[PDB]
């Protein structure tokens, strides 16, 4: 099945999906001298203080973090967005080098990592109608640089031990994702899809400017996790990353001048 090797990679994702040559696919290049401030964004409402984080599972793909979705506890409203997007879970996007590992890229700059917040619009009910819908999800993307150690970080990073490989799970309550966000909330947005199978163009993406700065150390521990199974060959789980698709008929808009 699909994965991030030669033989399984984003390169053939089309013959199971053909939806990846599709005309709103992620992630994008955003070039910076093209995006058009649009004064008429609204400065985006990140709702996080009642967030309740249930578990982080390995998912043979990325690790996700997971939130109780089953009511408004930890919502996205404002900026381009109409209603109100519920947490259901983040994840991130990394390299094997600090050099690539992001999906977006700003300039053909390639970050270390991307954090994808992703949200789910209360209107459809559960994800799985509202991943149906082209306003069925918003995600905020995060872009992560090298540097100094990120304090929030270093909960997740830890607990990476126990979910070494495919299918395992562990306990992980009363984590903070606030701790995770830039200190500025000026972001760029364009319509787009998941930018894993099955790639589906139900994403307004919300992509912040301002990375986060985590040590060498911190992304070193994603890079020991394993894309395989349990007592199976080892395969470090690197560049899980789907890389620039085509712009074709869309606009990326600027929240700042
Ligand atoms: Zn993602």
Redo the contacts with the bound molecule.
Sequence with gaps: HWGYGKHNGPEHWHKDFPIAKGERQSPVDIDTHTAKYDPSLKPLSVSYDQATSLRILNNGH?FNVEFDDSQDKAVLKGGPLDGTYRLIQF???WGSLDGQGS?HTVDKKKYAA?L?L?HWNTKYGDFGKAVQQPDGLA?LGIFLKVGSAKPGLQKVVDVLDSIKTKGKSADFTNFDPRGLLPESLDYWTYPGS???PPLLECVTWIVLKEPISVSSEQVLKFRKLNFNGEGEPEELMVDNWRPAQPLKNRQIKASFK
């Design positions: 990325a994840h991130f996007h999906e991307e994808h992703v995600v998941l930018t894993t």
